[PDB]
């Protein structure tokens, strides 16, 4: 089927340039569709940035003045976004999508990519296991967790048992403080499955190319 996937640096210093890539598979971008870029600011506000259709035609949002450019590499089936002299106001989540003449996008949207504009430095997180103090009421449920502390910038992906553990999982939004984020995640499982079965939280921080796998062990 057709799929769109954005890629690019997750952190950029103010006044510098931003470059993003959208890889399209299962469909040719030399078609007369509006291969477009849209962004969402912290606060959920959505803004149309521009598009490219038929390989050589484009259009941009007037608010972006003359600092935006959209191009494509037909041989790789990729279109790009270029935003010059960025400021902290350009911090947002960037999405690529395929709009048609009538405004229909279908499910043709990428997963989106986060970009932060800051002078702060990239810092990997420290992943700490959260195991219960003592043994609670037997023959019931037990909650375990992971604390991901001191990273910058966002985001960070958190999973349990490489994804095979999905239900009963709650990952809380990150809280920023002193140019550093902290996030937590909990998972609830039958007092039986643990500690009999191993529970591990997988944490990946793309900006620092770091990955941590912390197994949860009884105190």
């Amino acid at each position: 089927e057709v799929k769109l996937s954005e890629s690019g640096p997750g952190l950029v210093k103010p006044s510098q340039s931003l470059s993003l890539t959208c890889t399209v598979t299962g469909y040719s971008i030399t078609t007369n569709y509006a291969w477009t870029w849209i962004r969402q600011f912290p606060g959920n506000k959505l803004e149309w940035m521009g598009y490219i259709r038929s390989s050589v035609i484009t259009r941009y949002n007037p608010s972006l003045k003359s600092r935006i450019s959209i191009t494509q590499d037909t041989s790789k089936n990729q279109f790009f976004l270029q935003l010059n002299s960025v400021t902290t106001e350009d911090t947002a989540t960037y999405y690529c999508a395929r709009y048609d003449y009538y405004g229909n996008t279908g499910d043709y949207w990428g997963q989106g990519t986060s970009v932060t504009v800051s002078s702060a430095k990239t810092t990997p997180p420290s992943v700490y296991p959260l195991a219960p103090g003592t043994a609670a009421l037997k023959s019931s449920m037990v909650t375990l967790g992971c604390l991901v502390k001191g990273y910058f910038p966002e985001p960070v992906t958190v999973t349990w048992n490489s994804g095979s553990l999905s239900s009963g999982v709650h990952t809380f939004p990150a809280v920023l403080q002193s140019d550093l984020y902290t996030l937590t995640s909990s998972v609830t499982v039958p007092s039986s499955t643990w500690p009999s079965q191993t529970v591990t939280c997988n944490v990946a921080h793309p900006a620092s190319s770091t990955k941590v796998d912390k197994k949860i062990v009884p105190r």
Partner: protein, 216 residues
């Protein structure tokens, strides 16, 4: 530039009833071809926007028939029939008649349901963090309703308010409840100067707060 307004929230809707979400444009969206170019999207937390309706009333492929849209030229309505837990999120409308294309500010669908006491869990700092000089005590309050909740920390009986960070999730897609994480951060030395650590939750579901604690 065409401006589209949307109410920030909707009155809470009970799973089962139908709800209508509105969107108003500063200019008419009826095009010279007789079609009205207005889109409706649904975005779930951490998800990308998903198209539900285009051309004011045409349902996108794969879209549930519980969704329908209508409107005139400046006022549009999205009707969601037999609302279910999964429909929670933010709804945006988008005009596609004149450049630049613009989106409305979004309307969050708030689901109403039966009250529920939160499940409380408290965790002592990990030995890994204690070697770093820091000490975080974590408390999880899971699956409660309504979202209004109060958490209080106590060290050796006395209330501590500094060094506390909180985080709340969005409404749950499965059971419509809320969850919250509360972290108390102290230095390793400070954490050593005391023995009793407690997390107290005060919810509508109970006169007496739910208390969780451990002794170092």
């Amino acid at each position: 530039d065409i401006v589209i307004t949307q109410d920030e929230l909707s009155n809470p809707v009970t799973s089962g009833e139908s709800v209508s979400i509105s969107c108003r444009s500063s200019r008419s969206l009826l095009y010279k071809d007789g079609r009205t170019y207005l889109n409706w999207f649904l975005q779930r937390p951490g998800q990308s926007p998903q198209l539900l309706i285009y051309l004011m009333s045409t349902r996108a492929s794969g879209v549930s028939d519980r969704f329908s849209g209508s409107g005139s030229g400046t006022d549009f309505t999205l009707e969601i029939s037999r609302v279910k837990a999964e429909d929670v999120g933010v709804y945006y409308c988008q005009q596609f008649v004149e450049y630049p294309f613009t989106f409305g500010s979004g309307t969050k669908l708030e689901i109403k349901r039966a009250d529920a006491a939160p499940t409380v869990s408290i965790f002592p700092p990990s030995s890994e963090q204690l070697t770093s000089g820091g000490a975080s005590v974590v408390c999880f309050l899971n699956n409660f309703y309504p979202k209004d909740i109060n958490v209080k920390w106590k060290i050796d009986g006395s209330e501590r308010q500094n060094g506390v960070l909180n985080s709340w999730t969005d409404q749950d897609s499965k059971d419509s409840t809320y969850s919250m994480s509360s972290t108390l951060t102290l230095t390793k030395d400070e954490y050593e100067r005391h023995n009793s650590y407690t997390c107290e939750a005060t919810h509508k579901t109970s006169t007496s707060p739910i208390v969780k604690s451990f002794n170092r």
